[PDB]
Amino acid sequence: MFDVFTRVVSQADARGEYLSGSQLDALSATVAEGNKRIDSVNRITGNASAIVSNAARALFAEQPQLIQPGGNAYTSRRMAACLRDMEIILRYVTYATFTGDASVLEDRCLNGLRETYVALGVPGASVAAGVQKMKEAALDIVNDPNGITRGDCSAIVAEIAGYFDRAAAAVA
Template identity: 65%
Template sequence: MRDAFSRVVEQADKQGSYLSGEDINGLSALIADSNKRLDVVNRLTSNASAIVSNAYRALVAERPQVFNAGGACFHNRNQAACIRDLGFILRYVTYSVLAGDASVMDDRCLNGLRETYQALGTPGDAVASGIQKMKDTALGIANDSNGITKGDCSNLMSELASYFDRAAAAVV
């Protein structure tokens, strides 16, 4: 996993140049927003169980054919795996928010996930729907302005949404 600082230094080194004013301004903005990132990660982590379980319940209600007899996730073991996987994805989304980089999620969570679901006969679009449900709940929790660092969080919320979108796209 590379953080934003490592990426900027690596890129400048490859070009054999000093950090540009744009690079330094971008890193300064990241530092200024670090408390907001920590607030978001703390909120998501504190509410992880509810985010995952609510997404799972909504997914079961939306796609009962997947969870009823004959469905890909009928057995308790498969249902537990679904909940576990949603939790893994949420955890890696929080890592990505903290780092400001999706590479850890790509490398350690999403790489090969589509193929795994295909091999298990699990419909990727159902998993993607569950991820989108987590996204909706997580954005609501993260965007609540009570008790967090004040300021414009629209870019951070867009970034957070993009990590969920990236995960959903990886499974279909």
Template identity: 50%
Template sequence: MLDAFSRAVVSADSKGAPIGTADLTALRKYVADANKRIDATLAITQNVSCIAADAISGMVCENTGLTQPGGHCYPTRRMAACLRDGEIILRYVSYALLAGDPSVLDDRCINGLKETYLALGVPLANAIRAIEIMKIATVAIMTETNTGRKMFEGINSGSGAQCQDIASEAASYFDRVINALS
């Protein structure tokens, strides 16, 4: 597993050179944006069930056959597995966001996910839709563009607009999962 810092180290090591001023510029930006990154992570961790459960519910609402007999979320045992998976994917996205690098998401979540779902007969289109809803909800909460109440207390509270870049980064991690399943 890598983070933004160890990613730079691995790439410098392949050249056998120490990390100098040029490479440090990007890392200094990562450090300077640390509070925003932490706020963005808090936006996820304070709204886990809201993001994950609502996404699964949204997926079912758009396709009510899922919870009918014969549907993929019937009986509740399978619905529960679906809710669990939503949370797991969200959890790995939160790790990747905190690390500033997708390797933890790739290694521990995405790798083999599609094969597992195909083997278990999970409908990929529906799974992708649930992840899309999680992405939309996460970005809205982070940037404080959701309708209704403010959804998280961060270090820079009231600074949702400042989380714009980090929110795009979070969206890219959800897209990574979506692409892997497509």
């Protein structure tokens, strides 16, 4: 896998060049944003169970076809598997936020996931709706101004929204 540094390292080794001034300056800016990135990872991790439970509540409230007898998320076994799937997707989104590159999210969670959900009969649009709800919950929790020092965090929120849209698009 790669993080925000080793992705640029792998690109430079493919090109066979040393890093220029612009790439090192971009990586230094990423290091400057790194504390905000770790704050985002900490907040989503600390409210992960709340995010998964509230997203499951809203998903099966707006889509009651899944929890009804016969629905995929019906039966405590399949429901526990669905809650595990929300927890796994949120966990790998936090992993991709931590690395700063989505290599862990593509290569470790989203690869074969669409074919998994097609072979299982899992409706991937419902999973994408749950990922959208985890996105809005996590972006509200990151952007909470209380209990943390002031600063601009539009870049990391945009990156987390990109990771969440990547997770939702891989199952849709």
